[PDB]
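Weekly sync notes, structure subgroup
Attendees: PM, AL, DS (notes)

Item 1: joint prediction request from the bench team. They want all three components modeled as one assembly rather than separately. Inputs as received:
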Amino acid sequence: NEAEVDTALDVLLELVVLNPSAMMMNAVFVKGILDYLDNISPQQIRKLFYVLSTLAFSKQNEASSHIQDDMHLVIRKQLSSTVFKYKLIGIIGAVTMAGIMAADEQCTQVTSLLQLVHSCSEQSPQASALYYDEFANLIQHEKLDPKALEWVGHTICNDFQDAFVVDSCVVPEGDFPFPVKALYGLEEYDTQDGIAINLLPLLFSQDSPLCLAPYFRLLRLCVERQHNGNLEEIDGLLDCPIFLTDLEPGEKLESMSAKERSFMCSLIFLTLNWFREIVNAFCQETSPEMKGKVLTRLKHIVELQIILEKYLAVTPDYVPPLGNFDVETLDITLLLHNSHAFFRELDIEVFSILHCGLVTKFILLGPPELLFLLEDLSQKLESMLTFSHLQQRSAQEIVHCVFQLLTPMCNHLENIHNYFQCLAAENHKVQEYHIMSSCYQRLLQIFHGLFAWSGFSQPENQNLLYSALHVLSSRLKQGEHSQPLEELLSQSVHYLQNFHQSIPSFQCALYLIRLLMVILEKSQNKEKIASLARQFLCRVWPSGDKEKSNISNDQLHALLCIYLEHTESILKAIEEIAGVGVPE
Amino acid sequence: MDQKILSLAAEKTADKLQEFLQTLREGDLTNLLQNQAVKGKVAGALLRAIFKGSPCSEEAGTLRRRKIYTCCIQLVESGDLQKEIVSEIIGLLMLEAHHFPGPLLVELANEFISAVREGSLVNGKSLELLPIILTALATKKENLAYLSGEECKKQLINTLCSGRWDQQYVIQLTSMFKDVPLTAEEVEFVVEKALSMFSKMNLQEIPPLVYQLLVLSSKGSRKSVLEGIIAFFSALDKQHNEEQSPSGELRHVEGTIILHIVFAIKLDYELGRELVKHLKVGQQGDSNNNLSPFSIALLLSVTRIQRFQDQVLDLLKT
Amino acid sequence: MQRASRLKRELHMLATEPPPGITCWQDKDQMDDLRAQILGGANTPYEKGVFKLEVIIPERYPFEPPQIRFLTPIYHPNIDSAGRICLDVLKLPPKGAWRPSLNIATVLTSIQLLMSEPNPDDPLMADISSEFKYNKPAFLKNARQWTEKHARQ
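Output from the run, pasted for the record:
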């Protein structure tokens, strides 16, 4: 069964690494596995082929390359299927073998198999999509000799710019009950140009397009391996206007939950995936105009996020079914069901932008551009520390790069937000205040998930705690080098408690108190916990409608499970809560 | 002659390639023969050009494809090419085998049927494509009438099973049924034909044959494989004892049979149960004539598995 | 080691009592490879030709097979331009049939046999094979031309 399988294959991998030689001579049973592959899950199949491949492609034993042939046979047979079930399996096997034989007949075999795979993949859309995807995965993971890559990438860019790139005509030909427009361009790129992309004429012609995002990913990665990080012939794609219908929130286009509601929700979903891909692409690049274009795309993305969760609240039934192809597609073959699962999941370097300092338009990078980055990091780190590209990365390096890009960079954002809400309470337009409130809610949510990380239970990460909580103590005063654990806790919590003048809502209030709790568990000190949870229970928390939807039930249940427990006299604290519960 | 077709295919489909395809109507045979003689990559390029320029929405390309299919079928076995070209051809054909109607693939099935029956198939590698064709037939809902594609598949496979096989080519025959989606009686007739084929075999050939018979038995068809092997080796050892009234070779066989039956019941915790149920003399207590030296040897080589051990050792005792 | 064991006996054996129309010595240029000479078999187009061959002994040889090449090229179906030998006896088990009961003299005898009887089943040269299959005199003519051009003094 499942775990058995999993573990076992882990072990086999360990064993081949331990000693390829002896394994070589028991290889025959390993080949003999291949008649039983009905019961395996594709993740397990991936490692299995990894095994058999690394087995076969030991140069010292090519005489018994019989297994190479057997593998090519089964590749062929499972490929040759109308049924996706076997086709995907073959695909996977093929690509893995390719990456593994990747350390000139080597290159001839490589390109032969590759073009074979491409031909097998092409006509089925999800197949070719997966093919690009896993090819991109292989290429980022392996530094292989760039001969088939310089061979393929000059054809991929041409096929891309003839399949999708179209002259910037506003309305193309075709019968549309939807006003087609070159919309959501960043408008620094001149609209009357060549580079613009065809979406709605393609999706209506369906009743190529779905794979657009991973195809661009492969294009990005092949050009990033050739030019070594340069995106010089692609800057037009960062800022071109997109051939979209009116993406105004269609409340007038209601009582219309027919196939056209599916067209609009899927269209918004696909362009969202497209912009998610664009922000994954242009994150690592340092050019400041391209960064500001990425800022404009981040706000475009959160705009289309609110538009799409509206368009799915319109009808809750019309699933636009497109999950990521690693784990999700096999389970098949409300806004939160698609937010993480359906949509394309983003890259860890995307948070190179939130380094920039907050600006305020209520009081006087954008606040909503930072809201989207922090909301991305929140869902990302709750997914990881509790996603294809990110799962290959261990959670330790994730929390590591978080300690650098968030904690010394978003301290200035938290301080500017303290100054924002202090001025807002002094005054006490509203959308700027609430976007800042939700930006702050996501900041403290990220901090809570950061310092609720169970890796700090292990002893090697206490040096990262002595760095992180010391840079938190640094916010009150610097120079307290090589402090005790409990003193650094006291300094970090004395720094974070002072924001209890600024916290506008209650979801941010509970993330701040539980953040104080998880940093304080490292340590008498129960008085600070009880008094500070009581301070947060006793503060106003101004009552916006969504601001009090942030006073959800299980949230207060968690806050009071903390306060009534850690308060020293639990029963006298219960007597106080009862005394104050009568005059309500 | 090729580079023109390359240039026609370089840009677009079914607008100039079709037009040129309606120029050169015959001589594809000799064309492909000099092609494989000089360089097989050109044959693959021609095949790609042909299948893009001969879509099967239009029915003229369907016949070009049927002709070139028969051409490759005959040459790949007879005309001894290089290995990589042969693999490539087979892969290409298995790729484009899906774009056909029912009856064209039915007549390709009848081609292979008559060929393996009588045609001295030089290498038999062409059979790799056959189960792809059976798959396309089963799945294609373009209904026939002679009736569904899956039922015409049943007919063709019943034809093949009731028909005679080659001595050399039973390995590959059953290797094809390996990956097919089959039902009870499908797999039953497959194994029954391969079973009755045992009486015309060298003995070094039986081990991998039974290996494949069993990995196919895995589908549903467990009991009859073992029952037949039992009766076979029972009569064999009786005949050998009457001769005594190649002993070392005969032993060497029986051993590796039992080894492979062990791996089988190792992977299937039910196989041994039916094995037991087939064998248990104590249905009421009267002696069955099912057991044998080889039977018992199999049981004792089995008892070293952790589950059946005590069960078997009680059975034998009683 | 067992390499040298086989080699020291096969050296003296092929020096003194080699097969008929075959000779072989330690290659006077290499001293690790061997120089063989198969004299042009009778009833063949390869007559009037002393075909030189290079013989490589792998280090595990009684277990590995040798690796022979025709240094003097040959117009043959089964022997390519370079002089490769697509023969089962130079290949490992079930692919081929090598075992230590065979040796240099046996495989050279097999090569001399092949030079008189081309294999139409295992061709390195498919076109020379089709010529030998259908047009016998053209194949024999081109082979005798190839022999008298290169193999003759």
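Discussion: The interface with chain B takes residues 29, 32, 35-36, 72-73, 76-77, 79-83, 112, 116, 119-120 of chain A (CB under 8 Å).
Action: AL to compare against the crosslinking data before next sync.
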